Structures are given as structure tokens and as C-alpha cells.
Design a protein around this ligand. Structure first.
Ligand SMILES: [Ca+2]
Length: 223
């Protein structure tokens, strides 16, 4: 996250860190046994780390639970990042409390102008590299589909939305991938891609979670 703020320990209780010996992606806890992330975060040997603030220090609220199964969206295209969404099943259920909590799926798609909270442990610089140990937060609006298409001609599908600031300076970034975009207490987006980070006229592009609810629910019900 570039140009965000320190969230505060366990203020984003649905935020997960995906760990394969190191933090490589974010994710969202959507019930006691399932995590949603980006399909581009797929790898085998995932440990899900819940209740994290400082990902380098054991602070006492963590749950570390292995993934039993990963399910990449059947139509995920790694070239276009269309349908950039994956489900991860935990080997056992997370213990839910005020610091580890599921985020609701949306019943409606969020409109342009909706303010959202994006969170992650990604790079905090637009040029060069500085990875924070503690969770960073950013409040950002959803941009009009027309702004979004103007910024990224020929790359935005109906399964993507833009959020952020066309002036630049405030964005998600590498290592925020797979993390949440929450608007009015509902998971609306997954941190998917962008051209660099926090560049002028190049906002963040997010997987449009409202399009995937039936797929998420039917997948969870049978696995
Ligand atoms: Ca920790």
C-alpha cells in the first residue's frame, strides 16, 4: 500500500496473509474455513495466517492453518487477469473472535463513488522497495467504469473495477495482491493488478467480487 496509514493491530480482522515460508499475498476470510484471494496468488504449500499485524513477530492473536485445497476460478486467464479470484479451504476451521472475523459477501455491486478500505503488507513505495511488517490501510473510492477504461484502454473487463486516485500517490502495490477491498462492510474487490503503483492516471484494478457470489457459494457448498 502506497500513501496509506498503519491500520492498527487486528482492526481488519478478515485480512489474511498467505505464507509459503514468507508473506506473498493477501486474502479475506469469508467464513471459518474459506479464504478468497487472487488466482495470480496460486501456489501449492500455502499456510494461511490469520490475526496478523506484524507478520515478522508472534504477537499472540495469530492462527496459522494449512490450506487443504485451492480452487482457481475455472475461467481465470493469467494473460488478461480476467477472473482473478481463487478460493482456499483451511485444513481446520479458524476460531472466530473480535480480532479474527469473516467479511460478508456482497448482495449488490458497489457503485462508482463508494468509499472502500484496501489493506495489505505490500510495497509502500511507487519507486524502489520498502515492505512494512505491519498492516497498511488505504481509503479509496471506486472509479467510474469510463475513467477505468480511459486509464487502461482495452484491458478492463466487466469482472474488473478501478479504485484509487487518478492524481496518483495512493494505491495498492506488489504484495497487496489477493487482499480485500471492503465497502460498507462487504467484500467488493480483490487486489488484482495495476501499471506500477500510485502512478498518475493508472489506478488499481480489482476483481469485481459481486460477479462471483454464486460461484463462491456453490463452490463452498460442495467442497
Ligand atoms: Ca504476527
Amino acid at each position: 500500500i502506497v500513501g496509506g496509514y498503519t491500520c492498527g493491530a487486528n482492526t481488519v480482522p478478515y485480512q489474511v496473509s498467505l505464507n509459503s515460508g514468507y508473506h506473498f499475498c493477501g486474502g479475506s476470510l469469508i467464513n471459518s474455513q474459506w479464504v478468497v484471494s487472487a488466482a495470480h496468488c496460486y501456489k501449492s504449500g500455502i499456510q494461511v495466517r490469520l490475526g496478523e499485524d506484524n507478520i515478522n513477530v508472534v504477537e499472540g492473536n495469530e492462527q496459522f492453518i494449512s490450506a487443504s485445497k485451492s480452487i482457481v476460478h475455472p475461467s481465470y486467464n493469467s494473460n488478461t487477469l480476467n477472473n482473478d479470484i481463487m478460493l482456499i479451504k483451511l485444513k481446520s476451521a479458524a476460531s472466530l473472535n473480535s480480532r479474527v472475523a469473516s467479511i460478508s459477501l456482497p448482495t449488490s455491486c458497489a457503485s462508482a463513488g463508494t468509499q472502500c478500505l484496501i489493506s495489505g503488507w505490500g510495497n509502500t513505495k511507487s519507486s524502489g522497495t520498502s515492505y512494512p511488517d505491519v498492516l497498511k490501510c488505504l481509503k479509496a473510492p471506486i472509479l467510474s467504469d469510463s475513467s477505468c477504461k480511459s486509464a487502461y484502454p482495452g484491458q478492463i473487463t466487466s469482472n474488473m473495477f478501478c479504485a484509487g486516485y487518478l492524481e496518483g500517490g495512493k494505491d495498492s502495490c506488489q504484495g497487496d495482491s489477493g487482499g480485500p477491498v471492503v465497502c460498507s462492510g462487504k467484500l467488493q474487490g480483490i487486489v488484482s493488478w495495476g501499471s506500477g503503483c500510485a502512478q498518475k492516471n493508472k489506478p488499481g484494478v480489482y476483481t469485481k467480487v459481486c460477479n462471483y457470489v454464486s460461484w463462491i457459494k456453490q463452490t463452498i457448498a460442495s467442497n
